[PDB]
A = this chain, B = another copy of it.
Amino acid sequence: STSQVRQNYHQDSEAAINRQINLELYASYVYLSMSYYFDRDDVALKNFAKYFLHQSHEEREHAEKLMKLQNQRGGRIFLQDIQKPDCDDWESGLNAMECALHLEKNVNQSLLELHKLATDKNDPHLCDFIETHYLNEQVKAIKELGDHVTNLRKMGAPESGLAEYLFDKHTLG
A74 to chain B, nearest CB (A): 6
In whole angstroms, what is the CA distance A130 to B127 when docked? 13
In whole angstroms, what is the CA distance A44 to B132 when docked? 26
Main secondary structure of the interface of A (DSSP, over half): helix
Task: Check if B71 sits within 8 Å of A79, measured CB to CB.
Answer: no
Q: Please tell me if A143 contacts chain B, counting CB pairs below 8 Å.
A: yes
With A3-B41, A122-B116, A140-B72 known as contacts, the answer to whether A77 contacts B84 (CB < 8 A) is no
Which of chain B's residues has its CB closest to A45's CB? B151
Contact of A42 among B72, B125, B150 (CB under 8 A): B150
Q: Give the size category of A's interface with B.
A: 35 or more
Interface residues of A (CB under 8 A from B): 3-5, 7-8, 25, 29, 32-33, 36, 39-44, 46, 53, 60, 64, 67-68, 70-74, 76-85, 88, 101, 105, 108-109, 112, 115-116, 119, 122, 124-125, 127-132, 135-136, 138-140, 142-143, 146-151, 153-156, 160-166, 169-170
Task: Check if B165 sits within 8 Å of A155, measured CB to CB.
Answer: yes
Task: Check if B84 sits within 8 Å of A88, measured CB to CB.
Answer: no
Which of chain B's residues has its CB closest to A125's CB? B135
Task: Check if B151 sits within 8 Å of A44, measured CB to CB.
Answer: yes
Which of chain B's residues has its CB closest to A105's CB? B7
Residues of B within 8 A of A140 (CB): 72
Task: Check if B155 sits within 8 Å of A109, measured CB to CB.
Answer: no
